[PDB]
Amino acid sequence: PSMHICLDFIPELIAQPELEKQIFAIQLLSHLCIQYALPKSLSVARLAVNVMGTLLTVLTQAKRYAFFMPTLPSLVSFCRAFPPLYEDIMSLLIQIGQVCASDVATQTRDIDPIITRLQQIKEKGSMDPDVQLCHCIERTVIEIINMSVS
Amino acid sequence: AEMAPYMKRLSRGQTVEDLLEVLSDIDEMSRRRPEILSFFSTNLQRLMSSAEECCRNLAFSLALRSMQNSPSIAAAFLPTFMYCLGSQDFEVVQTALRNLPEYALLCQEHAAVLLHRAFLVGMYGQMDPSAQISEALRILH
Amino acid sequence: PFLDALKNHVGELCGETLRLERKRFLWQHQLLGLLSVYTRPSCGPEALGHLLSRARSPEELSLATQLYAGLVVSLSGLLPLAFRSCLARVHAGTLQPPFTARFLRNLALLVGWEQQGGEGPAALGAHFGESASAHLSDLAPLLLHPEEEVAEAAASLLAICPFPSEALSPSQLLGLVRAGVHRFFASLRLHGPPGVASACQLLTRLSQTSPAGLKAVLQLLVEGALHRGNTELFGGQTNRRHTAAVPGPGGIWSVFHAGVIGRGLKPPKFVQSRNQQEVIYNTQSLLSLLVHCCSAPGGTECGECWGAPILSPEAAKAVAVTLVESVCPDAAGAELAWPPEEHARATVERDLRIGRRFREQPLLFELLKLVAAAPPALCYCSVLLRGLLAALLGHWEASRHPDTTHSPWHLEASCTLVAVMAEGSLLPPALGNMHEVFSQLAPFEVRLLLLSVWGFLREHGPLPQKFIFQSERGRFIRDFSEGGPHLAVLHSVLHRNIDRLGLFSGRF
Amino acid sequence: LRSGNYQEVIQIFIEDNLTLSLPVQFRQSVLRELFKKAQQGNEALDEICFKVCACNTVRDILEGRTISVQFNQLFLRPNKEKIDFLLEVCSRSVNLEKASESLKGNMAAFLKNVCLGLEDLQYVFMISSHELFITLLKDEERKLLVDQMRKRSPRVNLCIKPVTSFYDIPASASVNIGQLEHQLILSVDPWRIRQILIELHGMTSERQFWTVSNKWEVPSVYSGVILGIKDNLTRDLVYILMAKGLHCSTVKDFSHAKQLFAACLELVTEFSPKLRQVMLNEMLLLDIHTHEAGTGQAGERPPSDLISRVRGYLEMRLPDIPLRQVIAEECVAFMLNWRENEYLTLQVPAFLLQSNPYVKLGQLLAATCKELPGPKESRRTAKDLWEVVVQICSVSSQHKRGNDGRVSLIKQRESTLGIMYRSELLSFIKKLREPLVLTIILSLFVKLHNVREDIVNDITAEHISIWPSSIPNLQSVDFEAVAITVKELVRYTLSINPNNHSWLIIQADIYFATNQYSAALHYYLQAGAVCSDFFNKAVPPDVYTDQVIKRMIKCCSLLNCHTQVAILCQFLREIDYKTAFKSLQEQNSHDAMDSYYDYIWDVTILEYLTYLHHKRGETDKRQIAIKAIGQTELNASNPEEVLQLAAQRRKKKFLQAMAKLYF
């Protein structure tokens, strides 16, 4: 029960030059928001969404993949805990998606996930990192939609 | 039995002017008692994915009015709406994405796949459908 | 009111008609026909989709054909609406993978029955192929469907589905090419050699439509067989334990070591040991597809009984271009004129990376065998040959073994490269004998022979000219206006090793 | 010794032993020598060349190596003797199933994977004829093989006859008449129709049998005359025949419609000549439709019989037969599509020419289309076409006599003075299939579209623009109707043949004018793939001009794709660094900035990117930019024979990536 105090050093943990510290801070804040619901928690979650959105344009592909693979369930839990953030998250997701839409078309692939736009989700191996990131984005959006609709 | 000439014009009409005139007549006649809109389901579904702008807008408005009058028919416009989101024209998909919130609220059972295809079109196709899906999720709670 | 009430049960009505009973099915089919004729929307597309979506035996297809023949006298325009409704239901949640697979295979069977015959599709104007060609944009995403049944059905349908009056749209053409190559690779991964017929047929049918389509097909097929994926198919590729054994077994001093550098003891350490057999047959199937693609039509019984179709120069040129682009995208020395020998001492890194790319994927060599078929095609893929020759020269210059058998891959690559550049109408048969006698030659002798090859290629450079066309056939004959000093060096090398290469002298 | 002595048969017999003790290099060398000698003209026993190729292939597959390309080049189209010799060589090796234990598996695999092609089942039967197979292919397993070979090209038989479950001889009258009229409805042959109709007339009273189907819609132009017949049998027969012929012509069933119209004409030869001329006009229209769609879209030349028939029919106009409005536009389109410009307005110009607008518009279009090779600056017919087009799509009453709104040309459909309406020209153009006529009409409409229609100056240029710029009565015209009709014409001319870069560029410009950037880029890439083969070669300078690249930059700028803008700023004749630096300064890009730096071959753009990444503290992308600068391909000091090739390669790669991104 003494985990809420960790919020007081969650932003300080974000402003770190190491990507692992930032990912861990984002995940810890995600769990704290899915556990505790406070206006301060909402402010820290908004700051985390902002610092995640500003890190999309200052990271290379090899770092973008490793930074945005674990941190998408964090956005899912942020949506589950804070309704008013929905739009922002969606916008953010869209941006990231479009970035991936430009990363897959750059180099030739083996599965070609571009034509898979007209596909549906099926309830419920070794691939390309960009294709894996696209699939992770799609899956997290599906979970967000299923949580908000139900 | 009194809706024979309108159906004949909607089936045998091939020019834009005749279809527009028939759609405007049906819209102005459907001010009160929109139950008659339940008699033009197939024609509205066929004219929903039309290349014209005014005719497509009138068909979408008539379909939304018919679904608001009787939500039980909202499940019948599922395929014809998806075809609007998976077309290689960039014209009807804009109107479909604009009407997405109202149709998703009127559906309440298939909104998941609707929003999924909307996000897929917004990610792969170069656009920004953030506000639409945001309003949809806010209304659906 | 009777028909107005029965209209809301057309699904179960079709389900009962498809039971193939004694007499109930005839009456129910007549009722369906009367209901389709009565109502204004005519329920044509819906009933036709319900009939074609759950059809398993040819009797159901015959019943659907009879229904269309009975409704075509009163109605009009049923195939496009039915196909549109079926595709809209497929793209939606309706028409489950089994149902849509059955519908696609029934449509493929209908198209196949409409193609052949002189009395069936002639006495009943239906135009199944013409009505299905207007849906290639919707049938294309079905080739990469996650369900194998739907993908196979769509592949069998598109393999025989004709094209509209217009040739094709560039967007539709590119989508079809991508879907076809993806389906081909997936079927090679899952089914293997005997399950690619639909994909090869589709690619060969859509590649002979326009030169742009053929170039796109060849480029995508070459890039798909060399990517990091699907390359092992053709050629080949925390503190508790630290606490239970800590304190240096003394509990009063520091650790014995001073830390780690990186990680150490790399976990994966995996080696490519997939299989030996059934790997060359995938390469055979890919080369057969490429031959079907490049060979110009084709099928006119040339000669008397041994008609051999020639390879199109444009297709082989595009294959060579995409191969050069995939192997080495560099362009610092991409000129067709062969630089001098000393110039090879500056681009050693490019030659070494080309040699590594060739040794990691042997399929490249096979691709060269496709480029060496057309005479003027090998003149464009000169950067790869130059880099491979420079790498082989650099390896033979630093070889201490007195026998060539110590380096088997290097000797094999030398012989293969010389044979490819000789059969590509670039070298006299003396070089064909040289790569044969390479088997038991000294390393410095092989190096000097390859240096003479480099000198001859520098003098008589492979150029698009001097390949005039012949009025007999489409073959490009090269008339040598051969190498004096090169033949002298070859004769001296042969004479210095008479004690072992005596029988090889009488061949040339 | 046998090869040097010009004895190919001895060499083939010696090479077909497969003693497993021979240098494969010498065999491949002599094979290539034979191939070169056979391909250099005056082939010497090419059969022996195929034989030695087959021996080399079987030796290679038995040793465990890949199959050469010559085997496929030879077996692309096999025959009887080829497969026979292949099976003979495959069954004449050493140690024939005695003590091998290893060659059997290779033989089985080769025989399994050699039947992948061979679309003809006769070749598979010939393969499986010798001993029912070679080495039996591990029998009890060929079941799935023959199953998949039969399923690869199946063949089924279906029925065409409808479900006539009505039993014969019902011993009644009502059900008998019902079955008879049902068979009549389901009947197509005119003889059976006549028999059923005469039987019904003989067995029943003097009641009409033509009103037995509400789906037989006969136009009212001929309905008043088709009912003015004393005898009921003849009028019923002619009505049924005309209705069925029209329905077959609508469903594209000319095979039966021709016979129906022939039987109807033969029956009418004894009747009044009015119905005879009506059926002659119907047969002419059916023949036109058949020659335009039935014989194929790739027609070469009409047989000059139906052309003369249409000419005479349009020239006589003697009787008072009611002409149909559809037939006139159909024959005008038929004359205009087959390049009949020799028949200009100088022939029969006053004998009822200004009355029919179809022939007038067709003649004026044929006159204004042939003026392009007429380099004299006259363009009188072009001015007449422009005037009539601007007067058709304009409101007749500028004072708005209808109402207060602007629903005159969109909803009221009136106030469209001239020769036709605004929708009749659409149906007339939709019947036209001609690149020159279609592109002339499209240029005219797009020139009439960009004349003071809005505030923005995004004038969509076109190749053929010789129309006058002066617009009389700019208020009576309807800009919305012009936009609608030009969009419809663009859609039609793209549905005719999408392989046209000019029409795709026009569509992209129209989409860019309507604030549609994604579709504009889609159609721009489509035109680029039309002109150059999937961007494999350099795009022509007239297809991708400076304006097109500037419009692409404008589309990608407002699409949150800034690195794509910076890359596109290099396709111009002069690189515009201002807009590139303005776009690269944004921080809301959606185009994978760090993944498009390999497509940049300009040192200035890379230097600016490095400076921007160093200023913002982005070392990860700054190092990538420096590594891209430190490439050998781009050095700003090459002799220009290397920089151009690298630039072209990067252009091809970037264009292919953008084409894979969109559509």
Swiss-Prot record, chain A:
It is found in: Nucleus; Nucleus membrane; Cytoplasm. It comes from the Eukaryota. Component of the Integrator complex, composed of core subunits INTS1, INTS2, INTS3, INTS4, INTS5, INTS6, INTS7, INTS8, INTS9/RC74, INTS10, INTS11/CPSF3L, INTS12, INTS13, INTS14 and INTS15. The core complex associates with protein phosphatase 2A subunits PPP2CA and PPP2R1A, to form the Integrator-PP2A (INTAC) complex. Component of the integrator complex, a multiprotein complex that terminates RNA polymerase II (Pol II) transcription in the promoter-proximal region of genes. Belongs to the Integrator subunit 2 family. This is Integrator complex subunit 2. It comes from Homo sapiens (Human). The chain holds residues 1033 to 1202 of 1204 of the full protein.
UniProtKB/Swiss-Prot annotation, chain B:
Disulfide bonds: none annotated. Signal peptide: none annotated. It is found in: Nucleus; Nucleus membrane. Changing residue 120 to P: In NDCAGF; uncertain significance. It is linked to Neurodevelopmental disorder with cataracts, poor growth, and dysmorphic facies: An autosomal recessive neurodevelopmental disorder characterized by severe global developmental delay with motor impairment, cognitive delays, absent or severely limited speech, dysmorphic features, hypotonia and cataracts. Component of the Integrator complex, composed of core subunits INTS1, INTS2, INTS3, INTS4, INTS5, INTS6, INTS7, INTS8, INTS9/RC74, INTS10, INTS11/CPSF3L, INTS12, INTS13, INTS14 and INTS15. The core complex associates with protein phosphatase 2A subunits PPP2CA and PPP2R1A, to form the Integrator-PP2A (INTAC) complex. Interacts with ESRRB, ESRRB is not a core component of the Integrator complex and this association is a bridge for the interaction with the multiprotein complex Integrator; attracts the transcriptional machinery. Belongs to the Integrator subunit 1 family. Component of the integrator complex, a multiprotein complex that terminates RNA polymerase II (Pol II) transcription in the promoter-proximal region of genes. This is Integrator complex subunit 1. The chain holds residues 2045 to 2185 of 2190 of the full protein.
From Swiss-Prot, chain C:
Component of the Integrator complex, composed of core subunits INTS1, INTS2, INTS3, INTS4, INTS5, INTS6, INTS7, INTS8, INTS9/RC74, INTS10, INTS11/CPSF3L, INTS12, INTS13, INTS14 and INTS15. The core complex associates with protein phosphatase 2A subunits PPP2CA and PPP2R1A, to form the Integrator-PP2A (INTAC) complex. The keyword Cytoplasm applies. One of its GO terms (biological process) is snRNA 3'-end processing. This is Integrator complex subunit 5. Belongs to the Integrator subunit 5 family. The keyword Acetylation applies. Signal peptide: none annotated. Keywords: Acetylation, Cytoplasm, Membrane, Nucleus, Phosphoprotein, Transmembrane, Transmembrane helix. It is found in: Nucleus; Cytoplasm; Nucleus membrane. The chain crosses the membrane at residues 63-83, 363-383, 437-457. GO terms for cellular component: cytoplasm; cytosol; INTAC complex; integrator complex; membrane; nuclear membrane; nucleoplasm; nucleus. It comes from the Eukaryota. Component of the integrator complex, a multiprotein complex that terminates RNA polymerase II (Pol II) transcription in the promoter-proximal region of genes.
Swiss-Prot record, chain D:
Keywords: Chromosome, Disease variant, Intellectual disability, Nucleus, Phosphoprotein, Repeat, TPR repeat. It is linked to Neurodevelopmental disorder with cerebellar hypoplasia and spasticity: An autosomal recessive neurodevelopmental disorder characterized by global developmental delay, profound intellectual disability, seizures, absent speech, spasticity, facial and limb dysmorphism, and subtle structural brain abnormalities including cerebellar hypoplasia. Component of the integrator complex, a multiprotein complex that terminates RNA polymerase II (Pol II) transcription in the promoter-proximal region of genes. The WFEF motif is required for the recruitment of protein phosphatase 2A (PP2A) to transcription pause-release checkpoint. The chain holds residues 333 to 995 of 995 of the full protein. TPR repeats lie at residues 1-24, 238-271, 501-534. One of its GO terms (biological process) is snRNA processing. Component of the Integrator complex, composed of core subunits INTS1, INTS2, INTS3, INTS4, INTS5, INTS6, INTS7, INTS8, INTS9/RC74, INTS10, INTS11/CPSF3L, INTS12, INTS13, INTS14 and INTS15. The core complex associates with protein phosphatase 2A subunits PPP2CA and PPP2R1A, to form the Integrator-PP2A (INTAC) complex. Belongs to the Integrator subunit 8 family. This is Integrator complex subunit 8. One of its GO terms (cellular component) is INTAC complex. It is found in: Nucleus; Chromosome.
